[PDB]
Amino acid sequence: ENLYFQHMKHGRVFIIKSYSEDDIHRSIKYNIWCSTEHGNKRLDAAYRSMNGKGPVYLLFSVNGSGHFCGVAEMKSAVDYNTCAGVWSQDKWKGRFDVRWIFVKDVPNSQLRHIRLENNENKPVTNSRDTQEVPLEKAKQVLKIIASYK
C-alpha cells in the first residue's frame, strides 16, 4: 500500500493533454510548462487563488499514446510574455514552473474505471486539456500512478 495521498484535504488537480512528447521531455528537463491561452488562464487562476495553502498537481498524457506519462506540481503563476518559439507551437509565449513528481507510463486501462462527476461521469482517461478532477477521484488516480509496476 502507498497511502501518501490518502489523506489530502487541500489541493486541485488538472489533466494535461499534449500534442507533443518533445514538449513533455523539455518540461521534465527544465521544469517548465505552457498550455493554450485558455488553459493557462484556468491554471493561473487556480494556482493564484490557492495562495500556497495546498498543491496544484498536473496529470500528463500525450494525445493518442493510450497512457499517462507522469505528474508534476505547479510551482509558479503564469508568465504570459517570455521567449517565443520554445514549444511545439511556435507562437506560444507563456511559461510557468513545475516540479515533476512521477515520470512513468501508466496505461489508460489502469485508470479507465475512474469517472469524473463534474464531466458527465466520463472516464478520467477521456479528458481534454486542463479538465479539473475532483480531489477524491484525484487521490485514486495518484495512488494508482504512484504504485504502478
UniProtKB/Swiss-Prot annotation:
- Mutating K17A: effect? Decreased binding to RNAs
The record's subcellular locations are: Cytoplasm, Cytosol; Cytoplasm, P-body; Cytoplasm, Stress granule; Nucleus
Q: Gene Ontology terms, cellular component aspect?
A: centriolar satellite; cytoplasm; cytoplasmic ribonucleoprotein granule; cytoplasmic stress granule; cytosol; nucleus; P-body
Q: Which UniProt keywords apply?
A: Acetylation, Cell cycle, Cell division, Cytoplasm, Differentiation, Host-virus interaction, Immunity, Innate immunity, Mitosis, Nucleus, Oogenesis, Phosphoprotein, RNA-binding, Spermatogenesis, Ubl conjugation
Give the span(s) annotated as Interaction with m6A-containing mRNAs: 9-149
Variant or mutagenesis effect after changing W87A:
Reduced binding to N6-methyladenosine (m6A)-containing RNAs. Reduced ability to undergo liquid-liquid phase separation
- Tissue specificity note: Highly expressed in induced pluripotent stem cells (iPSCs) and down-regulated during neural differentiation.
Effect seen on changing R128A: Decreased binding to RNAs
Q: What upregulates this protein?
A: Following heat shock stress.
Q: Where is the YTH domain?
A: 11-145
Q: A GO molecular-function term, please?
A: mRNA binding
* Single Gene Ontology BP annotation: hematopoietic stem cell proliferation
Provide the binding site for RNA.
Answer: K17, S18, Y19, D23, W33, C34, N63, W87, W92
Principal place of residence: cytoplasm
User: What stretches pass through the bilayer?
Assistant: none
Share the record's PTM remark: Ubiquitinated by the SCF(SKP2) complex, leading to its degradation.
Subunit structure comment from the entry: Interacts with CNOT1; interaction is direct and promotes recruitment of the CCR4-NOT complex. Interacts with YTHDF3. Interacts with RIDA/HRSP12; interaction leads to recruitment of the ribonuclease P/MRP complex.
Q: What does this protein do?
A: Specifically recognizes and binds N6-methyladenosine (m6A)-containing RNAs, and regulates their stability. M6A is a modification present at internal sites of mRNAs and some non-coding RNAs and plays a role in mRNA stability and processing. Acts as a regulator of mRNA stability by promoting degradation of m6A-containing mRNAs via interaction with the CCR4-NOT and ribonuclease P/MRP complexes, depending on the context. The YTHDF paralogs (YTHDF1, YTHDF2 and YTHDF3) share m6A-containing mRNAs targets and act redundantly to mediate mRNA degradation and cellular differentiation. (Microbial infection) Promotes viral gene expression and replication of polyomavirus SV40: acts by binding to N6-methyladenosine (m6A)-containing viral RNAs.
Q: Could you give the domain comment from the record?
A: The disordered regions have the ability to interact with each other and to 'phase separate' into liquid droplets within the cytosol following binding to mRNAs containing multiple m6A-modified residues. This leads to the partition of m6A-containing mRNAs into membraneless compartments, where mRNAs may be stored, degraded or used to transport mRNAs to dendritic arbors in neurons.
Regarding protein family, the annotation reads: Belongs to the YTHDF family. YTHDF2 subfamily.
The protein here is known as YTH domain-containing family protein 2
